[PDB]
Amino acid sequence: NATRFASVYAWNRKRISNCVADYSVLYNSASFSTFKCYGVSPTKLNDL
Amino acid sequence: NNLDSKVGGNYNYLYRLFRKSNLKPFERDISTEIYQAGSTPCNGVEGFN
Ligand SMILES: *[C@@H]1O[C@H](CO)[C@@H](O)[C@H](O)[C@H]1NC(C)=O
Numbered sequence: 001n002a003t004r005f006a007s008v009y010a011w012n013r014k015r016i017s018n019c020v021a022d023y024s025v026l027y028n029s030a031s032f033s034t035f036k037c038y039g040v041s042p043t044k045l046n047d048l
Numbered sequence: 049n050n051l052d053s054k055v056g057g058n059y060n061y062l063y064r065l066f067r068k069s070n071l072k073p074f075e076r077d078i079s080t081e082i083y084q085a086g087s088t089p090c091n092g093v094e095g096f097n
Contacts, residue, residue, distance in 0.1 A: 028087050030096050043085060
């Protein structure tokens with residue numbers, strides 16, 4: 001829920017650390033179009 | 049390779065990526081029912097997750 005995103009020539013980065021990462025608000029929120037993973041099963045994100 | 053590969057691809061060879069729980073030894077599963085990854089129900093041939 002950022003207001004403005006960055007441009008892909010200069011793609012922004014925010015580091016996430018020292019905190020608990022609720023992936024249910026990511027995974028079960030149907031508002032997004034696509035969500036794909038490349039070394040983890042996405043339901044197991046909460047188990048990692 | 050030289051007995052059944054096809055240059056577009058032999059798309060008759062299929063395998064299962066999704067299953068509700070790990071199968072018992074020597075169990076067979078022909079099911080073509082759709083798999084529910086997220087919390088949502090999913091009647092019909094397709095849907096989100
Ligand atoms: C973004 O903001 C709205 C309103 O506060 C909220 O309903 C929505 O869940 C937020 N997005 C995410 C990913 O939680």
